[PDB]
Amino acid sequence: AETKEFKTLYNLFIDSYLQKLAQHSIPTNVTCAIHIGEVIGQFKNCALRITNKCMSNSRLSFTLMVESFIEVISLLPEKDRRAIAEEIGIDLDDVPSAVSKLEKNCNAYAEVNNIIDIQKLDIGECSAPPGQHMLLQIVNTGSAEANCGLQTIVKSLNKIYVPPI
């Protein structure tokens, strides 16, 4: 039959984040200044879903990006929440609109990185047991700094397994 989904926390995050992206479209899209043209990682039974859904500014991306992270991470024990939040660079006490260290780290990476309209994205490890698949929805928001934020979140939440239900 068809392979069953090997769900992780990133699935919960992206599903939350995609809902917010659809609402915060004022038009439908603007001119996507950047596109995802290159995905790297270690693939075993990987299911990638690449979509464009770009918007006006990265601050709005990171805001809903942070709302979803806080919303999803709360399903973890206390010490697990603060530990991963510190690795990504998000403060669980700040309001979801506060510029996290993640966003500043991403904004700073964009100031030196290679200009051009194509972005490479590293999804880390996309592996699932035989008979299963890891769905990994990657959304381009037309910003190099926002795509950097999603990448950091992928490479962390993707390692945390959600038992099936």
Numbering used by the authors: 2 to 166
Source paper text:
The VACV strain Western Reserve F9 ectodomain, consisting of residues 1–176 with an added N-terminal 6-histidine tag, was refolded from bacterially-produced inclusion bodies and purified to near homogeneity by immobilized metal affinity chromatography (IMAC) and size exclusion chromatography (SEC). F9 crystallized with four molecules in the asymmetric unit of the crystal used for data collection for refinement, resulting in the 2.10 Å structure. The F9 ectodomain exhibits a bundle of five α-helices (α) packed against two pairs of β-sheets (β). Between α3 and α4, a loop of 12 amino acids protrudes starting with Gly90 and ending with Ser101. As the transmembrane domain begins after the α5 helix, both ends of F9 are close to each other and to the viral membrane. The atomic structure revealed that Cys33 and Cys55, Cys47 and Cys127, and Cys107 and Cys149 form three pairs of disulfide bonds. Cys47 is located in β2 and together with Cys127 it forms a disulfide bond, which stabilizes the β-sheet pairs at the bottom of the molecule. In F9, α3 turns proximal whereas in L1 α3 is located sideward forming the entrance into the hydrophobic cavity. This cavity is missing in F9, although a hydrophobic area similar to L1 is found. With regard to the divergence of F9, its differing orientation of helix α3, its absence of a myristoylation site, and its lack of a hydrophobic cavity likely contribute to F9 functional differences from L1.
